[PDB]
Every structure is written in C-alpha cells, then in structure tokens.
Amino acid sequence: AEIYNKDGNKLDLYGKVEGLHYFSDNDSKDGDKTYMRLGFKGETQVTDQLTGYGQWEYQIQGNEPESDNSSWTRVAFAGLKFQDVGSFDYGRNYGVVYDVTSWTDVLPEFGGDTYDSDNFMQQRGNGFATYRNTDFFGLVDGLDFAVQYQGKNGSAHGEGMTTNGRDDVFEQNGDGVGGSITYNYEGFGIGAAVSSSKRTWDQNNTGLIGTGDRAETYTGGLKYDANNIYLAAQYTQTYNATRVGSLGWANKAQNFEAVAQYQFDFGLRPSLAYLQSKGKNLGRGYDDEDILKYVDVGATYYFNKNMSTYVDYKINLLDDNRFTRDAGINTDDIVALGLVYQF
Amino acid sequence: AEIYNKDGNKLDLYGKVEGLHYFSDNDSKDGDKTYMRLGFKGETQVTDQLTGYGQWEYQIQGNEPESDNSSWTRVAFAGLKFQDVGSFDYGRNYGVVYDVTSWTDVLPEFGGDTYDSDNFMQQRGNGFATYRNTDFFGLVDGLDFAVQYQGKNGSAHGEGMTTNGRDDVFEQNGDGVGGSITYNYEGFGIGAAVSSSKRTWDQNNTGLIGTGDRAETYTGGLKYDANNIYLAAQYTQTYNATRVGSLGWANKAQNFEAVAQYQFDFGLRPSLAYLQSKGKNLGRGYDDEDILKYVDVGATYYFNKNMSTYVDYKINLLDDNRFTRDAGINTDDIVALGLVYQF
Amino acid sequence: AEIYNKDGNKLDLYGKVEGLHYFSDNDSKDGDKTYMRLGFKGETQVTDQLTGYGQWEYQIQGNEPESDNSSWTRVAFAGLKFQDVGSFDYGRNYGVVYDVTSWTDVLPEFGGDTYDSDNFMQQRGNGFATYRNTDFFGLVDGLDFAVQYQGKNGSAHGEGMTTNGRDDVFEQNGDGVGGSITYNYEGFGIGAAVSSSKRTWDQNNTGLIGTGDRAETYTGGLKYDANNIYLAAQYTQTYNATRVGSLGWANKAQNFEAVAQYQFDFGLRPSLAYLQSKGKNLGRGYDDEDILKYVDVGATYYFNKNMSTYVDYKINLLDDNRFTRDAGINTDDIVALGLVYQF
Ligand SMILES: CCCCCCCCOCCOCCOCCOCCO
Ligand SMILES: CCCCCCCC[S@@](=O)CCO
Ligand SMILES: CCCCCCCCCCCC
Ligand SMILES: CCCCCCCCCCCC
Ligand SMILES: CCCCCCCCCCCC
Ligand SMILES: CCCCCCCC
Ligand SMILES: CCCCCCCC
Ligand SMILES: CCCCCCCC
Ligand SMILES: CCCCCCCC
Ligand SMILES: CCCCCCC
Ligand SMILES: CCCCCCC
Ligand SMILES: CCCCCC
Ligand SMILES: CCCCCC
C-alpha cells in the first residue's frame, strides 16, 4: 500500500500474512506453514526522465516457536531508470533467467521448483548488476531485454573467500553473465534467456555430483495472458546448475513446466500445472533419473484485492527408489490450504 | 497507528519502544531489558457483512550487542469475519485459555507467568484454528465464545516430526482442542475456558516430570472493569501442562492470579497483584511445592496515549530450597523501571 | 518519511537500501556488501513544553543467502524532553563520546573506525541513560552538553552476569559515566568529551593485552560547516578502551581523524580524510604500533534527497608485519562502490 507520496518521492509498504497448512504422508512436509512477507518499494523522480528507486522484501516465518524464529531478505536493491534508455540496479535480486521461467511460477503454493534461490542466476541471488531496456529504446513496443552480471559469492573461509561468503556450497557462485529477451504482443508472449556462471573451487571439490568449470542455462518460454485465460510453458536445459537433492548438481538437466489457468468473474481461479526435471548421466551409478515430476491442481478464491483463500494439490509422480532416497527428494503428495491477507 | 485507509482496506502499523531496566540480587535478572515491539493489523471489507483480516506482531530485543541480536514473531494470522455468524482465523495466535487468563495479565511488566508461550493452548502458539462468536449470533449482548483446534507441533527429527518441528520439548504439542465462554455486563465479567492437548512422544520420553497422555487445563475467571477501577481474578487447574522450571511439567498444578488497579484522572495508575502456582505430587521426591508465588506492587504514569513510565516491584515469596535450585526458579525480588513510547 | 501526524503524535518511518560492493586484495573485504536500514522516529506532544519520544533503527544485511541472513538493532530508546530544561532517554543509543567523534564520521563508506560499536561509551551500546541540555537552559545559543551513565553489560554466565550478558569480552562493560560539551557559532564548532567505564572481570582475566580497572577516553574536536565547506578534526586519547584486533585493547592509544569536504551546487561532494590510531606500550613484545592508519579519498554524487551514488577509496597505510598479522588487522586497500535509495 502507498503510504507516502510527496515532493517527488513515493513509498509502498506492502505485505501479507499467509495462514498456511500442509497435509502430507511425508512428515517433513506436514503441518503448519504460516508465514509473513513484508516489503517496501520506493520511487523518486530526479528529473522528468530519471527516476531513482529501491526495493526491499523480507520473509518471516510464522510457524516457529518464539525461542527460534527465522527470517530472510528476498530482495534488496537500488537503481536508476532513464526514459527510453533503460534501467540499472544492483543488489540482491532476481536472476535474468527468471525473466522467462517466472511465466510458469504462478501456482497458489507449489511450482517454481525446477530451480532454487541462491542457485546461480536462475532465481533470487546476491550481487546482481542488471541492465534492462524496455520497448527497445522506445522503438519496438513489447520488446524487452536484459544483460546481467553476478559477482562471485564465495566461501566464508580460506581460498575463494568473499566478504559475504557462505559455507553452503549450493548457495555459492563465481562470476556469471546472463541475458534475456522477451516479446509480448496482444496477450501472446515469447522469450529466451541464457546464463553462464563460473563454479567455485568449493563447489567442484567437496565430492558432489555435477561438477565442472561452469554452471550454464538455456531457457525458452511461451505464454498467453488475456481474456481471463492464462497459459504458459517453459523449457530449460541446464549444465552443472540444477540441484539434485543433497547429492550435488545435474551434469545435464532437462526442465519443463506448463500451466493453464482461468479466472471466473465471481472470483474463483482454477489451476492445472505440470512440472518435470529430467537428470541425464548424473554419475555415481545413477545414469538418467527424474529429479522432479509432478502434476499440480489447485484453485484460489479471491474475495477482493486484499483477501484470498486457496487449495493446492501436488500430485507427486516420482517413484520412491534408490536415487530419491539417496538424494533426499520428496516423492509424496502434498495438499496446501491457505487463507491470505495482503495489503 | 492507522497509516492507510482507502478503497475498502485499512492498515494499522503499531509499535512501542520500552526503555526498560531490571534491578535484582539475581544477576540473571539484573540489568538492561530494553526492547521494541512492532506489528500490523489489517482489515478489509469484502461485503457489508464479510470482512477479511490479518495481523502480525514481532518483538525485537534492544538490550543486545549488534553481533548477536534476537527477535521473534508473537502473532501471525489471517481470518474472515461474517456479521452475526462469527469469525475464523488461522496462524500463530493466542490459545483460547488466554481469553480468560488474560484478565489478570495487566501488570506493568510482571504477571502472566503461571504459564508460558508455546505452552499448549495456554498462550501464544503455532497452528491455531480458532472460531469465535460474539454476542451469540447477535442475540445476547456480551456473550462471546470460542472453539479452537491446535495442530500437532512436533520434533525437528525422527518419529513425531512436523514440518515446523522444534527440538525444545517444552515448545512441542500434539493435537489439541479447547473452548471458552465469557459474559460481560455493565463492567462485570465472568468466564470459563477448557483445553485438552495430546502430549508428544518426546515430551513423555526424555525423563522429565509431569508426563502423561494429555495436557489439560480448566480456568474460571471474574473481573470488574468500570469507574476507573479494575479488579480481576483467575483460577486455573492444570494437568501435565504447567512448566516447572527445567524439571518438566506439574502432574497437577493449581494456579491463581488476582489483581486490583485504579486510574487517577491525572494519569497515575497504581497496581497490586498476587500470583501463585502450586505444584501437587510432582515426582522425583518433591511432592507439593510452590512453582511460583509473588506479590506485585507497581504504578504506571500515563503522560498521554503515546508515552508512559512505570515501576513494577515483584516481591518474590518463594523460599530458596532444593526444589527451586534444581528447577532453576528465581526466588529473588525484581524491580522494573520503564519508559515507553508507543504509536 | 513522515507517514503519520495526527492528534498529538507523529511518526517518521525512514530507511535506505545501499547497493554496495567492496573491491580488495583482502578476500575478507572483497565482494557484495549490499544492505538495508530501517527505522522509526516518533514524537508525541504531551504539553506545550513536554514531548515524549522514541526511536528504533535496525540494519538488515542484503548480501547473504536466504538460509542464513543477519540483522541487528542499532538504536532503541525512549525519552522525554522538557523545553529549556533538557531531555532524558534510556535504551540502546550512542555514547556521549560520539557527540564529538561523530564530526569526522562523515565519509561515504569508511571512517569512524578508531572505535567500535559496543565499545564502552565510544559509540552505539546498551543501557545508556542520557541527559542532554541544548542552548544551556535556553540561555546560551549553541552551547550543548550531556551527562551519561551506562549500566554494566556483563557475561552470559557465572560471575559478572547480567540479564543481557554477552560472552564476547569486547562487547562487555562495567558501570560507566561520561560527559560532553559542544559550542557551535556561525558554522564553527569546538567540543570535548570524557568517559570512564569500569572494566569487567572477564575483560581483565582472559589473557588479553590492555587490561586494568577502567576504560577511559578524552576527546577534543573542531569543525567548520558552512559555505559548502566541511572541515573537521578529532583527537582522542584512550586507556584500556581501544580495540587492537583480536589481541585485546591498547594500554594507551592516540587516535586522530581529520576530514575535508566540499559540496558543488550540481551535486558532487568530494571527500579527503586521514585516520590514525597509535598504540603505545601495548605489551606482549609489541611496544608502539599503529592500530589503524589510512588516507581516504571519495566522492558522493547526490541526485536529490532520496538518491545518491559514491566511490570511497581507503588507501591503507599500515605495513604488513608481525603485529598486524597477530592482531588480524587489515593492511590492504579497499574501494567501495555504492548506489543508495533512501526515504
Ligand atoms: C568468461 C567471459 C567473461 C565475461 C566478462 C564479464 C565479467 C563477468 O561478470 C563479472 C561479475 O562481477 C560483477 C560484480 O558487480 C559489481 C557491480 O557493483 C555495482 C554497484 O553499483
Ligand atoms: C539510469 C540510466 C542509466 C542506466 C542505463 C544502462 C542500461 C541501458 S541499456 O544499455 C540496457 C541493455 O544493457
Ligand atoms: C467480578 C469481581 C472481580 C474480581 C474480584 C477480585 C479482585 C482482586 C482483589 C485482590 C487484589 C490482589
Ligand atoms: C477472587 C476473590 C478472592 C479469592 C481468593 C480465593 C483463594 C484462592 C486460593 C486457592 C488455591 C488452592
Ligand atoms: C553507575 C551507573 C550505572 C547506570 C544504572 C542505569 C539505570 C538506569 C535505569 C533507568 C531506566 C528508565
Ligand atoms: C561498465 C558499465 C557499462 C557496461 C555495459 C552494459 C551492457 C553490457
Ligand atoms: C548475454 C551474454 C551471455 C553469454 C552466455 C555464454 C554462453 C557460453
Ligand atoms: C542506582 C539507582 C538507580 C537509578 C534510578 C534511575 C531513575 C531515574
Ligand atoms: C586495487 C584497488 C584500487 C582501485 C582504485 C580506483 C580509484 C577509483
Ligand atoms: C485432520 C484434517 C482436518 C482438516 C480441516 C480443514 C480442512
Ligand atoms: C591522496 C593522498 C595519498 C597519500 C598516500 C600516502 C602514502
Ligand atoms: C502446594 C503446597 C506447597 C507448600 C510447601 C511449603
Ligand atoms: C588527556 C590526558 C588525560 C590524562 C589522564 C591519564
């Protein structure tokens, strides 16, 4: 909600509380998942063509006891935007790959999980320098593109250390570069994204699968978004980039997500989705295995802009086998039930 | 403070800073206790009869160094309210027992401590589904009641695991059910509450006192709140529910709290209170012991709605003996001195 | 930004996002330093002469992954202010020494580091009771002074325990007292501050250098702040007060900071600074050593009140030798590059 608009600056303080419960035969996925999100979005007019901006968003778990409660920053970035020239921002932000994979990340609770946070340039991550150009310098309506650099986020100790080092190898990265292009016309959308990040020494030298010099991704995507209908599909091919449970990464992974949704005038929005991550030549005697495979059925009822409720049903199609047990991957179904206040 | 009210939604961002110091011969109770509280309370009109709402409240300690600062979510819930029918909300919230025990929880700093947070359905806790009906379907002014279910919050590992598991056994619970009834007329209040929670395996199998299948509470309460006078008393009988320091819980505990307060026109509000928790047949050679016993004398001076100062004097009547030392219970007096800004 | 002003209370919710990157040959100083700051400042009119107030400020790192994100309270205090009589506030706040040392703490990113947080009464710390008088009871325009007491913040365990105890010996303190006087006339400023804190048992008995009964500081300072020119210098002499890396404190330290800045009408503000901390008779075979010594060159460009960008270049003049390696002191240069949105 816009709580300030005055003398060239405006500020939106926004947030939600999601009363959320998971039901599953997998006990680690069963029970209270209530949480809160909170952020600010600030925009200042410097000149008629130049705006300055910043955004910060935080998540705070509401399902924990008071002696041990966890929270985290999702995004935190500052930038400048010049008219018909583009924008630049730096901070914690979304990897440019997400400019396309985001098109299928629209389910009530599940979805968006053929990749992770702090997973190279695929989703949220630290130290993104992002240039964006919208409508191609004002010349081609609907043609957007982005160039992005992500600086090394290394270990907390020793060789490969950065000031913001983290010991979880799955959250590290070397220097990376990526780009995205998207074209939208009359509700139809086509898009493509590529990224290439150097892998750190720790990532290649702690005995995990899916090692090599570089983590790489190539994504194609399509969407239709008009007349109350939302259709979208993304295909992504990754190398040393896609996490395979606790085992490491996939030497090669083939990822696919498709979604269909409809919005009835009275407020109900049914949803049907399919997601799949296919691991190829994984190593360690595993060969080809599904990392992820599920169908998703759900519905959100929107009372108005500030209040909604939903059910999301993940029909988990993975078989319980050696690989999924070793990897620690959930092969059970989950139902999510939520009641959501936002401002 | 209401910082947004527009197009069917309103938002109260509220908070306080309590400059607070404790004085005690017990060194673990002596010194700086400064802290901050912050929250939001949001209400949306869906139709003329249906409102949606959410609330989040957070505490942030202000008495710690910057290298190691602790905070936590007190409440975080979403709900719906239909006129003359009732409300439902789910999240982290107050156990229905507190609908009555809260009547004596009005001291400047102390009080409210014959029970804990994350202590079955007695106070704040995770995963409360709460139905409430006010004025009995609009038929009986002042007659309110509540039915509440609390879902299992189990261990972080192994048998009895939940997705939000916690290893501190004192913060776990099984499935629980409770109810409350309250009648208020012309400043007089009568009320009752019952709860019954299943105990977890961990809680019954780590060698603590006060084990059994279920944690149970029965509470009766009375209050007078008018003509600048506040009188209140609550009696609660608990089984396997009341924490006894580090030792476990009380097989049976008899808890009593009484409070008298007066508000002078010029701003001073003196306070006198008595609290007692009597443990019965505790086990481990202890038999009957006082878990808590103190008299409380204090005064709050209210400069206005946003600024106040207070002294609270806990006259601790527990004797230093084997039980209190073993349990780690404070038997010393504490004086609290506070200066409080709120919005 | 002022987001509430109503019926005698006002509230400023303020904050910034600093997209920040460090470049250094020292890997522990190299990489993403993005962070967010957020606070509130609240003022209530009680009477025409008496205001109540509170302030809370929090920092949240934005350079960390989502599994492990760190934050902390910088200030958190409540107070009262009576006209021509002075103010009193209690909480976590700034030590009165900072009333003068702050005059050189104006660099874009570096500076302000001949002392620390939670470092006796030199900067931010817990449990400050501060009295302040501005314009000497309304009689001498520009004459301000402060008397401050800081209560013991002791260990988490055993002898010397406080309720807010901390095991990091560098963050502990005994009871302390301090004062400050400042005179400002027509852009010229002269000032002095003294503090004296008792040292804790832990601080004197864990085998560190720079032990003794008391940590003491004496500070003199000068500034010129007009006609777009900012000049400032502070000299501080400390005993058992100034931290020497991991080794302990300096038996005596001589600290000096000087700063020159200019603000061009079009927005650029160049900055040149010099900082030095000279350790005397340190013990452990070290004798006299520089604890800190660097020249600082930088520039901030202010797009407007809400948006700015800067480069800060710390030319580190310390030599890599036995002392700096043993102490763990950075002897390398750092360049900081920042883009800053604030409200
Ligand atoms: C192997 C081909 C290399 C391609 C050249 C590009 C270099 C790779 O990306 C560098 C990542 O580091 C960028 C760090 O960002 C610092 C920006 O700070 C912005 C603050 O406003
Ligand atoms: C705020 C104006 C300065 C930033 C513009 C830089 C990016 C524009 S364009 O080059 C995007 C493609 O890289
Ligand atoms: C309905 C009557 C209100 C309850 C009466 C008890 C008041 C407490 C007095 C004891 C003071 C410590
Ligand atoms: C509410 C008016 C005074 C009530 C005092 C009753 C005695 C309570 C103690 C019994 C616990 C076993
Ligand atoms: C000798 C100095 C010790 C300081 C004691 C601090 C007490 C201040 C408490 C006031 C709280 C509002
Ligand atoms: C050095 C900053 C400009 C980099 C060019 C952006 C397009 C790749
Ligand atoms: C926008 C530039 C990205 C380059 C990707 C490199 C593929 C090996
Ligand atoms: C040692 C005496 C405590 C200080 C009281 C402060 C209240 C103004
Ligand atoms: C190796 C750090 C030196 C960079 C200084 C650049 C000055 C703008
Ligand atoms: C045990 C299942 C309870 C579900 C109630 C709300 C769906
Ligand atoms: C910009 C001034 C540099 C002084 C360097 C001293 C070695
Ligand atoms: C519960 C009765 C306690 C008495 C001990 C002296
Ligand atoms: C400025 C020096 C003070 C003297 C006390 C040791």
Side-chain angles (χ1 to χ4, degrees):
Chain A
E2 183 173 275
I3 64 159
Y4 188 80
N5 190 332
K6 186 160 180 159
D7 296 326
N9 194 48
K10 70 197 195 191
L11 184 61
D12 181 345
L13 176 62
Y14 67 89
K16 69 178 187 184
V17 194
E18 190 142 330
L20 182 57
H21 195 91
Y22 276 23
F23 302 95
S24 188
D25 293 327
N26 182 341
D27 293 327
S28 64
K29 301 289 182 165
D30 192 73
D32 185 33
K33 289 283 287 159
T34 296
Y35 73 92
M36 188 270 314
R37 252 174 223 163
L38 174 56
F40 77 70
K41 194 190 298 201
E43 176 168 316
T44 181
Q45 288 267 343
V46 183
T47 76
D48 309 320
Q49 296 168 284
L50 184 62
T51 64
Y53 62 93
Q55 176 166 4
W56 175 69
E57 183 177 292
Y58 204 58
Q59 179 157 326
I60 309 188
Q61 281 309 112
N63 61 339
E64 285 165 323
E66 280 177 33
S67 69
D68 182 15
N69 179 195
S70 57
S71 59
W72 59 85
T73 295
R74 282 163 58 91
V75 302
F77 62 84
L80 302 165
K81 183 171 203 138
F82 198 73
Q83 183 61 38
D84 300 341
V85 172
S87 64
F88 172 84
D89 46 65
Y90 179 78
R92 176 165 181 94
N93 209 340
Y94 284 90
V96 81
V97 177
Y98 195 73
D99 292 350
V100 184
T101 61
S102 69
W103 296 356
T104 49
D105 196 10
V106 295
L107 311 192
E109 169 68 3
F110 303 116
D113 52 345
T114 58
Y115 50 90
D116 299 280
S117 308
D118 297 284
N119 182 203
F120 303 102
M121 310 176 74
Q122 296 176 261
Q123 203 226 51
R124 293 185 294 280
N126 302 126
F128 288 122
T130 318
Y131 303 85
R132 299 186 170 279
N133 187 314
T134 67
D135 302 312
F136 200 77
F137 304 90
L139 300 179
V140 189
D141 293 318
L143 192 48
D144 301 352
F145 75 91
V147 175
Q148 197 177 53
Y149 306 88
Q150 175 173 39
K152 191 174 195 166
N153 295 308
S155 45
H157 305 284
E159 294 147 37
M161 178 167 40
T162 60
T163 187
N164 67 333
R166 52 286 234 121
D167 283 329
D168 186 347
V169 144
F170 292 103
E171 297 172 334
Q172 285 176 18
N173 61 269
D175 293 341
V177 193
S180 75
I181 325 207
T182 63
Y183 183 66
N184 275 273
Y185 185 70
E186 282 275 72
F188 292 93
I190 320 168
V194 182
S195 66
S196 181
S197 298
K198 210 187 163 211
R199 282 165 55 92
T200 69
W201 193 85
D202 266 25
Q203 279 172 331
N204 291 330
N205 288 275
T206 58
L208 308 173
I209 66 170
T211 56
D213 209 292
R214 295 195 80 92
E216 294 180 328
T217 76
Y218 310 86
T219 299
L222 296 166
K223 77 177 172 185
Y224 179 77
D225 183 3
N227 303 300
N228 302 318
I229 301 156
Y230 190 85
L231 299 167
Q234 72 96 347
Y235 177 78
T236 295
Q237 203 153 296
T238 73
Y239 304 78
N240 306 324
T242 298
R243 184 180 176 164
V244 183
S246 54
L247 287 185
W249 305 259
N251 284 311
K252 181 190 178 183
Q254 295 174 326
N255 303 330
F256 178 74
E257 309 183 16
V259 197
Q261 297 190 337
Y262 190 78
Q263 178 69 60
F264 293 97
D265 274 13
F266 67 84
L268 184 60
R269 183 177 180 99
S271 194
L272 183 65
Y274 177 78
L275 284 80
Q276 209 193 3
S277 183
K278 295 213 230 172
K280 302 291 175 179
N281 188 40
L282 295 175
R284 206 168 263 171
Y286 288 124
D287 289 312
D288 299 355
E289 293 269 357
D290 294 325
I291 297 160
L292 185 87
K293 188 172 183 176
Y294 70 83
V295 180
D296 189 276
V297 188
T300 303
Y301 181 77
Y302 291 98
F303 299 96
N304 64 10
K305 278 168 184 182
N306 298 109
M307 200 67 39
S308 54
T309 192
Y310 67 74
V311 59
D312 214 352
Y313 185 18
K314 176 194 284 165
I315 305 182
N316 200 332
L317 298 167
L318 295 177
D319 289 315
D320 176 29
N321 67 14
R322 187 192 271 284
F323 168 81
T324 63
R325 288 193 225 98
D326 279 7
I329 299 165
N330 172 51
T331 78
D332 297 283
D333 294 353
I334 315 175
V335 188
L337 184 54
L339 191 62
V340 182
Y341 172 81
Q342 62 193 279
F343 63 95
Chain B
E2 183 175 275
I3 64 158
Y4 188 81
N5 190 332
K6 186 160 181 160
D7 296 326
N9 194 49
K10 71 197 194 190
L11 184 61
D12 181 345
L13 176 61
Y14 67 89
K16 69 177 187 184
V17 194
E18 190 143 329
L20 182 57
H21 194 91
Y22 276 24
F23 302 95
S24 188
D25 293 327
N26 182 341
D27 293 328
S28 65
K29 301 289 182 163
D30 192 73
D32 185 33
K33 289 283 287 163
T34 296
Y35 74 92
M36 188 271 314
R37 252 174 224 163
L38 174 56
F40 77 70
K41 194 190 299 199
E43 176 168 316
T44 181
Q45 288 267 343
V46 183
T47 75
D48 309 320
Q49 297 168 284
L50 184 61
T51 64
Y53 62 93
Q55 175 166 4
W56 175 69
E57 183 177 293
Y58 204 58
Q59 179 157 326
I60 309 188
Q61 281 309 112
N63 61 339
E64 285 164 323
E66 279 176 27
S67 68
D68 183 15
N69 179 194
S70 57
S71 59
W72 59 84
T73 296
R74 281 164 58 92
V75 303
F77 62 84
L80 302 168
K81 183 171 203 137
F82 197 73
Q83 183 60 40
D84 300 342
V85 172
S87 65
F88 172 85
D89 46 66
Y90 179 78
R92 176 165 180 93
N93 209 341
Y94 284 90
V96 82
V97 177
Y98 195 73
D99 293 351
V100 184
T101 61
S102 70
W103 296 356
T104 49
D105 197 10
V106 295
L107 311 192
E109 169 67 4
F110 303 117
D113 52 344
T114 58
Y115 51 90
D116 299 279
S117 309
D118 297 285
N119 183 204
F120 303 102
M121 311 176 74
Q122 296 176 262
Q123 204 226 52
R124 293 185 294 280
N126 301 125
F128 288 122
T130 318
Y131 170 91
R132 299 187 170 278
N133 188 314
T134 67
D135 302 312
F136 200 77
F137 304 90
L139 300 178
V140 189
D141 292 318
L143 192 48
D144 301 353
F145 75 91
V147 175
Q148 196 178 53
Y149 305 87
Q150 176 173 39
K152 191 173 196 166
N153 295 309
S155 45
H157 305 283
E159 294 147 37
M161 178 167 41
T162 60
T163 186
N164 67 333
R166 53 286 235 121
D167 283 330
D168 186 347
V169 144
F170 292 103
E171 297 171 335
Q172 285 175 18
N173 61 269
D175 293 341
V177 194
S180 75
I181 326 205
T182 63
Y183 183 66
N184 276 273
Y185 185 70
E186 282 275 72
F188 292 93
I190 321 168
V194 182
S195 66
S196 181
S197 298
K198 210 187 164 210
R199 282 165 55 92
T200 70
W201 193 86
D202 267 22
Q203 279 172 332
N204 291 330
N205 287 275
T206 58
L208 307 173
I209 66 171
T211 57
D213 209 291
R214 295 196 80 92
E216 293 180 328
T217 76
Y218 310 86
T219 298
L222 296 166
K223 76 177 172 186
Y224 179 77
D225 183 4
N227 302 300
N228 303 318
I229 301 156
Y230 190 85
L231 299 167
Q234 73 96 348
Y235 177 78
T236 295
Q237 204 152 296
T238 72
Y239 304 78
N240 305 325
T242 299
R243 184 180 177 164
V244 183
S246 54
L247 289 184
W249 305 260
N251 283 312
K252 180 190 178 183
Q254 295 174 325
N255 302 330
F256 178 74
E257 309 182 16
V259 196
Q261 297 189 337
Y262 190 78
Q263 178 69 60
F264 293 97
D265 274 13
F266 68 84
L268 183 61
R269 183 177 180 99
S271 194
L272 183 65
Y274 177 78
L275 284 79
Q276 210 192 3
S277 183
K278 294 213 231 171
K280 302 291 176 179
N281 188 40
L282 294 176
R284 204 182 155 156
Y286 288 124
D287 289 312
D288 299 355
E289 292 269 357
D290 294 324
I291 297 159
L292 185 87
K293 187 172 182 179
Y294 69 83
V295 180
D296 189 276
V297 188
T300 302
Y301 182 77
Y302 291 98
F303 298 97
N304 64 10
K305 278 168 184 181
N306 298 108
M307 200 67 39
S308 54
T309 193
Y310 67 74
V311 59
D312 214 352
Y313 185 18
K314 176 195 284 165
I315 305 183
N316 200 331
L317 298 167
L318 296 177
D319 289 316
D320 178 26
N321 67 13
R322 188 188 197 285
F323 169 80
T324 62
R325 288 198 194 191
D326 196 11
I329 299 164
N330 172 51
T331 76
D332 297 283
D333 294 353
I334 315 175
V335 189
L337 184 53
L339 191 62
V340 183
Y341 172 81
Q342 61 194 278
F343 63 95
Chain C
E2 183 174 275
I3 63 158
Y4 188 81
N5 190 332
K6 186 160 180 159
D7 296 326
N9 194 48
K10 71 197 194 190
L11 184 61
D12 181 345
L13 176 61
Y14 67 89
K16 69 177 187 184
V17 194
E18 189 143 329
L20 182 57
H21 195 91
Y22 276 24
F23 301 95
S24 188
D25 293 326
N26 182 341
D27 293 327
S28 65
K29 301 289 183 165
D30 192 73
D32 184 33
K33 289 283 287 161
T34 296
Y35 73 92
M36 188 271 315
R37 252 174 223 163
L38 174 57
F40 77 70
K41 194 190 298 200
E43 176 168 316
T44 181
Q45 287 268 342
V46 183
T47 76
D48 309 320
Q49 297 168 284
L50 184 61
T51 64
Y53 62 93
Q55 175 166 4
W56 175 69
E57 183 176 292
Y58 204 58
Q59 179 157 326
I60 308 187
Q61 282 309 111
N63 61 339
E64 285 165 324
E66 280 177 29
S67 68
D68 184 15
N69 179 195
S70 56
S71 60
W72 59 84
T73 296
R74 281 163 58 92
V75 302
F77 62 83
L80 301 169
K81 183 171 203 136
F82 197 73
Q83 183 61 39
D84 300 342
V85 172
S87 65
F88 172 85
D89 46 66
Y90 179 78
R92 176 165 180 94
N93 209 340
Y94 284 90
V96 81
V97 178
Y98 195 73
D99 293 350
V100 184
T101 61
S102 70
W103 296 356
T104 49
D105 196 10
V106 295
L107 310 192
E109 170 67 3
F110 303 117
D113 52 345
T114 58
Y115 51 90
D116 300 279
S117 309
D118 298 285
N119 182 203
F120 303 103
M121 310 176 74
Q122 296 176 262
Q123 204 226 51
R124 293 186 294 280
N126 301 126
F128 288 122
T130 318
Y131 170 91
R132 299 187 170 278
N133 188 313
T134 68
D135 302 312
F136 200 77
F137 304 90
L139 300 178
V140 189
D141 293 318
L143 193 48
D144 301 353
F145 75 91
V147 176
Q148 196 178 52
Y149 306 87
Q150 175 173 40
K152 191 174 196 166
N153 295 309
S155 45
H157 305 284
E159 294 146 36
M161 177 168 41
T162 60
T163 185
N164 68 332
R166 52 286 235 121
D167 283 329
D168 186 347
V169 144
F170 292 103
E171 297 171 335
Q172 285 176 18
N173 61 269
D175 293 342
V177 193
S180 74
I181 326 205
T182 63
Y183 183 66
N184 275 273
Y185 185 70
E186 282 275 72
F188 292 93
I190 321 167
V194 182
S195 66
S196 181
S197 298
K198 210 187 164 210
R199 282 166 55 92
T200 70
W201 193 86
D202 266 24
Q203 279 172 332
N204 291 330
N205 287 275
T206 58
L208 307 173
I209 66 171
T211 57
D213 209 292
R214 295 195 80 92
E216 294 180 328
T217 77
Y218 310 86
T219 298
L222 296 166
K223 76 178 172 185
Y224 179 77
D225 183 4
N227 302 300
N228 302 318
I229 300 157
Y230 190 85
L231 299 167
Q234 72 96 347
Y235 177 77
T236 295
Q237 203 153 296
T238 73
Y239 304 78
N240 306 324
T242 299
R243 184 180 176 164
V244 183
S246 54
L247 287 185
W249 305 259
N251 283 311
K252 180 190 178 184
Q254 295 174 326
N255 302 331
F256 178 74
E257 309 183 16
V259 197
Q261 297 189 338
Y262 190 77
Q263 178 69 60
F264 292 97
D265 274 12
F266 67 84
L268 184 60
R269 183 178 180 98
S271 194
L272 183 65
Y274 177 77
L275 284 79
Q276 209 193 2
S277 183
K278 295 212 231 169
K280 302 291 175 180
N281 188 40
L282 295 175
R284 206 168 264 171
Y286 288 124
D287 288 312
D288 298 355
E289 292 269 357
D290 295 324
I291 297 160
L292 185 87
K293 187 172 182 178
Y294 69 83
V295 180
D296 189 276
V297 188
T300 302
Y301 181 77
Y302 291 98
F303 298 97
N304 64 10
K305 278 168 184 182
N306 297 108
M307 200 66 40
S308 55
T309 192
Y310 68 74
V311 58
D312 214 352
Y313 186 17
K314 175 195 285 166
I315 305 182
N316 200 331
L317 297 167
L318 296 177
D319 289 315
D320 176 30
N321 67 13
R322 188 181 222 181
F323 168 80
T324 63
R325 288 193 225 98
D326 279 7
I329 299 165
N330 172 52
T331 77
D332 297 283
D333 294 353
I334 316 175
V335 189
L337 185 53
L339 190 62
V340 183
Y341 172 80
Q342 61 194 278
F343 62 95

